[PDB]
Amino acid sequence: GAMGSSTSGLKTTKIKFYYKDDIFALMLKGDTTYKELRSKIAPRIDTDNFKLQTKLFDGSGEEIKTDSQVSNIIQAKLKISVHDI
């Protein structure tokens, strides 16, 4: 009894967000999303509306706003920045 199929998994990417002067982290297994992060950040922000970006050296880069921007910060492990909105 053998099988050719196989469980396909990925490696949780460590992404440190930067809400104001505080910062947190997130482990994305690849199934995460932008609306997923929305609930994973809201509670770590103290609010329900904030703006995530690719924490650059100036302050923020492409404001993550789509499951792709997140899966991108996921495949590239980008430090995220969080603002209050």
Curated annotation (Swiss-Prot):
PB1 domain segment(s): 12-85
Subcellular location as annotated: Cytoplasm, Cytoskeleton
Purpose of the protein: Necessary for cell polarization during vegetative growth. May link the cytoskeleton to morphogenic determinants on the cell surface.
Subunit structure comment from the entry: Interacts with AXL2 and BUD5.
Note in the entry: Present with 6490 molecules/cell in log phase SD medium.
Protein name: Bud emergence protein 1
Organism of origin: Saccharomyces cerevisiae (strain ATCC 204508 / S288c)
Gene: BEM1
Region of the whole protein represented: 472 to 551 of 551
